[PDB]
Amino acid sequence: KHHSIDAQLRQLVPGKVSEDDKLIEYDALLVDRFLNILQDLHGPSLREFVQECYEVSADYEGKGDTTKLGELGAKLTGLAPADAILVASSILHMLNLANLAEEVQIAHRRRNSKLKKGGFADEGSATTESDIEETLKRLVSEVGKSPEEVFEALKNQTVDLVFTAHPTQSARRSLLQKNARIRNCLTQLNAKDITDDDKQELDEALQREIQAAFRTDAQPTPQDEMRYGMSYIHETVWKGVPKFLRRVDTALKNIGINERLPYNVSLIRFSSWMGGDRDGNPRVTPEVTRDVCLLARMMAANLYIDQIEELMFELSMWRCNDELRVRAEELHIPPNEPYRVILGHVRDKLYNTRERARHLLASGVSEISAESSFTSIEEFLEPLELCYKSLCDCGDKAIADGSLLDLLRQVFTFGLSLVKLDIRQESERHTDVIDAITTHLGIGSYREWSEDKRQEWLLSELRGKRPLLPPDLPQTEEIADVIGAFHVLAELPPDSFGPYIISMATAPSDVLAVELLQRECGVRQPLPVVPLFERLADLQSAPASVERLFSVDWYMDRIKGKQQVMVGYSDSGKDAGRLSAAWQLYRAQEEMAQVAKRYGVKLTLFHGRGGTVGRGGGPTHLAILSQPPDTINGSIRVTVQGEVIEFCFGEEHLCFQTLQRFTAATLEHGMHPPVSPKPEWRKLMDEMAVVATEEYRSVVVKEARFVEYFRSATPETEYGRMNIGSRPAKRRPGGGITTLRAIPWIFSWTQTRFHLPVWLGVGAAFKFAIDKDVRNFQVLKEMYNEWPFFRVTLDLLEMVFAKGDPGIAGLYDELLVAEELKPFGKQLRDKYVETQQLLLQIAGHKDILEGDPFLKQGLVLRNPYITTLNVFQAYTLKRIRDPNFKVTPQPPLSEYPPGLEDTLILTMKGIAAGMQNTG
Amino acid sequence: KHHSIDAQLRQLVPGKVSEDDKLIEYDALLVDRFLNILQDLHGPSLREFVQECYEVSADYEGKGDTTKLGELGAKLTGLAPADAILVASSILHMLNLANLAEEVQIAHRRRNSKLKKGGFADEGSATTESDIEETLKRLVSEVGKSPEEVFEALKNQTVDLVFTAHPTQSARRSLLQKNARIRNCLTQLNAKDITDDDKQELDEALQREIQAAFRTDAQPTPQDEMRYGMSYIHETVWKGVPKFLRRVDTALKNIGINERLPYNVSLIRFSSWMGGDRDGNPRVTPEVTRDVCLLARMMAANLYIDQIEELMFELSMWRCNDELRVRAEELHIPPNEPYRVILGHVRDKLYNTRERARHLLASGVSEISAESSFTSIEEFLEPLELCYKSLCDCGDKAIADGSLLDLLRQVFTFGLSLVKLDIRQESERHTDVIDAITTHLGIGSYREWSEDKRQEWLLSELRGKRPLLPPDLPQTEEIADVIGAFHVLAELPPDSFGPYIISMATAPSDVLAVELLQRECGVRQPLPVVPLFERLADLQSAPASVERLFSVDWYMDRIKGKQQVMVGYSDSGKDAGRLSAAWQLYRAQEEMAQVAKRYGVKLTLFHGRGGTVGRGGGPTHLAILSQPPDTINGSIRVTVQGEVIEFCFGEEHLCFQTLQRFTAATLEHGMHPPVSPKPEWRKLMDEMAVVATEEYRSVVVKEARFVEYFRSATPETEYGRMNIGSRPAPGGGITTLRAIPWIFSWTQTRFHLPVWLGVGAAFKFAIDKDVRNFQVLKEMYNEWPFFRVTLDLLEMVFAKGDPGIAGLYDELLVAEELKPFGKQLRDKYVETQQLLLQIAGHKDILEGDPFLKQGLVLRNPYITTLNVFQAYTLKRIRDPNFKVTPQPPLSYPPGLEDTLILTMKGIAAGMQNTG
């Protein structure tokens, strides 16, 4: 009940990483108060049990000795069911608090330019990266671009951030606000010259908010999961984008541009997969898609109604131009406040816009006319731009450039739906539909046809003028879902959507199949069709596939010089290992850009989950700068993984830094590409890729006992049976691991702190390269320090190794895998150790993350809570799986068998929360 | 276009009054940016004209030479009409900006205990006064009371602040928010370790907000006037009351009490006169009163709906006690969120309460049932206290003591109507009604009867059981308004009202007559009747009046041991001068408390306009402490003058300090009374009061041409015919003129005759009567809080005065025959000031409070400019022969009316409270 937890933290990180480093102080302040709440509510004994768990696990990091973990697991398994949930949830809440303190520290850390050493490596951490104006200054003076060149590059830039559902955590809006109050109490408490009484009251508030978070807690609807994905837009991003665009104005002033970024520049846009991605996800029906589109339009309408009402209060002026005065008279509270009369009308039409969507959502029908509401972005902006012009014509541009300019930038960023919905479906599901059509019409089986025959037939249909899809067509459930989805797209406004993405795209016929289905189902404004090239072979042939499409007269007419392609890191890494996937992805990008340049097509890349781009914080800055030259040119899409969305957008300043990161990195790359690889580097990457793929497949594909080990050393099977992914874990009820999807592949191996999908293959490749020529070792480290692609790739592996622990993995082994396969597990752990130390010698580090002590400190302070949940998980699995393993039921301390399922969910949630992004 | 305005301000106050004194820097930041905006929109010529006006006036303060101002006035009268409005409004906006920086400066001044010298004098300024915690610690350790004594005193304490309309200024809610953004930009701009880009953008923001205030322009309804008066409640007081009560909890903990102040303690309450006061105000009809009552209930429902919705977001818990779980089940969005289920129902009934009020306001009728809404504070409280007890029963009292405790404290502070409405009406209007009743019934003329006969008749009616008021009584417009008003009181919920105040109350029959009318018009829960004793003769007989009332069996049964009495400072001062009024008020207070103690009645005093109690900032703290011993005992009502409401409640921290002030001073007085006056002090006050009254009446009553001087030397008649006071100012002496115009007109000219006239005859007489007396007057100033606060008010008003400006009005507007009379009055001014400083032991005005001195003088460049503009504008308004050479442009007869109202608004804004 008495001692603080900070002694254990100082053992982990002796020493401050900066002068204003207070992370351990903050962690102690929050956790000590939590434990006191725990004791007040549940008695001293369990408080001391919980703190002893934390102390044991903290000791383990300093002295990697498994037996003390086994001690702890013995104690944990003996707890009564109620106590087990209570201790697991307590450890979870402490991890949350520690993450909140980590957020506060990042947000308020003073930038210290003495940490910069120059060059691209500075851009890999928030402690050293360039802000937007530093980037603007560099482009002008070091690279030699003119201010007007930079200004027009920005005018043509667009970064599209795509939200995807969080696999394990909901993110209720009311919880995001508890988080904020805890963060606010924390910063205010540690203010400069704070009063005794202020500090006393802030302390009581902090204790109050921690308790409130501790005393609050079936899968959610896809509708609900979408509502929860939009919380971060309501809490930071809505207000955040005007604030960042204003900083871009300030930066432009400070390089000599004497005008603001025009308010119609969509510098940042936001998209969503929630309700649109149905790849292997049959709960995402056509109706779900129609719903999330209407839900988004209600959310937008209410956000705008609030902004407009705040603006009405402010714009009390009476001086206006003639166009506004005539319109204000026509709408006829007081007539001598014309800006309020216009905006009052806009609010009226926004209210109708909202109610119309609400009615369509409930009944499917609305007697509120589309005339009385806003149907297009253009008719929404007409009165707003009239207010802006009027203020400017009267010499009040300074007033206009305040809240009204914020609103206009919000309209051009968010539109009438906040986010544009991406649609995604698997290519073979489209083939199924087309085969159904061809057989029913009696012209054969489209599935049996070769790729060239498919293209020939599709093109004759696309070029012909006679319809194809009979309403009579006999339909499976899956075929009816595909057709029904297209029918929904045809019925909804085109501005609700972005692209239609084809999972597992392999050839041009996959793209033109969707183009034909779109048209024959009546989508009169078709969606851009985006192939997702997942396997290594598909990436290798992607430039050929894109060239064939660009060589077809019909398709060039359709796309109007714009094509989007999606690439997946976790996807391709599951096929051949991360190193080989990384290198083929680089080559595919540079050759696809070459194809696009020859054919006059502007090619935009969409970066899927598990990438270097899309990491939390600074690493994304360098990752974008590291992409092949001339592959961005002001247009890029990046998924915002649910695992990092809290750190990227949960807090005002973190949101700002994220928007600035993507904007600055994208802008600089277009005018300042990284160095082109020299032939020695390409040859080495080529040779290492062969070795890495071979050894990855040697463990993953060609070893007969791999799946049996995987199902024992990981909690996969439980993850699937509990539907923690709200999605089937596999496409076929059998198959190899090739049928398993990426999310479960990465999830299961990071739960055990082993992370095999991220690093396997790298060890074989590094040792092969060094051993075949004495020179190769020096050229590898030269690559690490001069080639951003290689640097960024390896830094990802370093971060994952900091999150890994072979001892914990071996703990899962000893209790869950059969004797026969335990030597296989230690073989894998041998591969782990050899990859890590080879990784360290390249890059020239003696310790993991020696180049980023800030990240090292932040990661290390999470592990006491994580490792505790690790041993709780491993022992919970053994109880779940073995009726004969005996436990000593200890007396209380104030599906599956009792409590075990709840405990396991809690460990899964907590470990995922602590591990965030891996591969 | 070029140089900053801070040079001219340094000239008036060179030195810093504290380490963190940045007031001149702030004034310069705001005004330099304003002047650049002025130039950007209207050209350099006009900007440089406006700045030249400022510097001329700023130079005049340092070198009191009238020639300066005359040449400025020549320039001002030359302006074309559009330029004149534009220059006067510019000067006004700059004064507003200077006031905003003064607000920022007071709000964020770091407390410095080394300034304290111990004793009651520390409580006269915010820089030295005791917080609530230092007050509790002093009561325990310096006075020697126990912590549980102090805790019990707080539980029984009620301070009620009464809002009254602002005579000249709107206070729109959108303006208060522009003010807030300017202040916020100011403080954020001067935060430490601010980044260059943050500073750049904040600067742009501050420029943008100043411009927005500059490009925002019939008198208002009494209804609109009321919702403008409620804006301060929406902006700071609503959130401020729970903040302060939480500080009271912290203070209690730090003296040994380990429980919070119970949430049902009404430590602070709020009242309004807006729509209730109809004294000499024929608009303010019965329906006006009905309207502002329903408007208040709508505003309350809106505020509660917002608080409840934020609370629902927070209270996600699922563990509750049995009582709540049962009622949550009966209300059946998700059922595992019981606290949200209950609060959702509360919100529904609040929505109904609002809509019902809106319907009653528009049509007079509502199909929305009273059952589906909240009609009493008790049924509103029932589900909220259920939530509180449920959270406590589950070991979550810590969560309950957060936002939910804030909400319960708001309910017990504001009720369902935010404020309670005071009704006020003159006593002769009630006599008119009763004389119409007695003549119509053939009983005779109630007006002709002596006071004894009136009481005899009224008491036989109130004791009788037969009704009196015939429904076919012939009614004049005035009589119908009185009866109609009472009829509205009978129709509205009792908790909408506070007391019925009788202006010009003279005798018990005034109080008893209202009790009879109230009953005869059907008010079934009568309002407490409080007399307002205004003339000094009425204050001297006030104790006999309340003793006669307390000796009547019927009235004792009605009041149930509680009586409220109202006293007026500006009212009594207009009768016989401020010094005699102050001393008569003191004796009346101690004599009424003595009567009250003898009859077992709890006497609550209500302090009206123009007092020491009710000044802005620290002086109110000492003023309350200076009240006669045993006249508060935890119960006091104070007027919040509209002149000081911005400085008291406009900003978060100022609101906090205001509530803390009234609470701490009231609490302490009940357990630490001031010294009792020594017999020598009483005898000296008695003799000075005679001399002061006779000197005041010799100028105001007994000099035949005083009204002619008054109507020329001040803008009184223009203030009347423009109805700047929203109220009549029939034709008699000066005795028929109301108090607000009497103070307003003399404050515009910077002369302030009503506040000081008489004081110097009294001081001169006392000193010259006996050589011991000067020493005694100095000891009274250092040892008698009553005398100290009385003279500190005079000192503050002299700081705001300037005889040169008053002489400038004279020279321009007074006939040659009366100019020597004005010179005699300015002689009386200079003599009173000099004698005042001698007794206070000061070489200069406000030498005892350099913080107040600095704040006042930095306003004078803007005020003085408008003074010059005003004086010359009036002579143009009054004289067709006065010639002006029209200057070419720089961008009543034309423009003169609008410039005059602009000067009146600006001067009043800068002068705030005087007498």
Automatic annotation (TrEMBL), chain B:
UniProt cross-references to SUPFAM superfamilies, sorted A to Z: Phosphoenolpyruvate/pyruvate domain
Origin superkingdom: Eukaryota
Record localization: Cytoplasm
InterPro entries documented for this protein: PEP_COase, PEP_COase_bac/pln-type, PEP_COase_Lys_AS, PEPCASE_His_AS, Pyrv/PenolPyrv_kinase-like_dom
Enzyme class: lyase
Catalytic reactions of this protein: oxaloacetate + phosphate = phosphoenolpyruvate + hydrogencarbonate
Cofactor annotation: Mg(2+)
Pfam families: PEPcase
Keywords: Allosteric enzyme, Carbon dioxide fixation, Cytoplasm, Lyase, Magnesium, Photosynthesis, Pyruvate
Entry keyword Membrane: no
Active-site positions on this chain: 166, 574
E.C. no: 4.1.1.31
Example of a GO cellular component annotation carried by this entry: cytoplasm
Gene Ontology BP terms: carbon fixation; photosynthesis; tricarboxylic acid cycle
GO molecular function list: phosphoenolpyruvate carboxylase activity
Subunit structure, interactors included: Homotetramer.
Role this protein plays: Through the carboxylation of phosphoenolpyruvate (PEP) it forms oxaloacetate, a four-carbon dicarboxylic acid source for the tricarboxylic acid cycle.
Cited PANTHER family: PHOSPHOENOLPYRUVATE CARBOXYLASE, PHOSPHOENOLPYRUVATE CARBOXYLASE 1
Family in the record: Belongs to the PEPCase type 1 family.
Stated name of the protein: phosphoenolpyruvate carboxylase
Natural source organism: Zea mays (Maize)
Gene that encodes the chain: ppc1
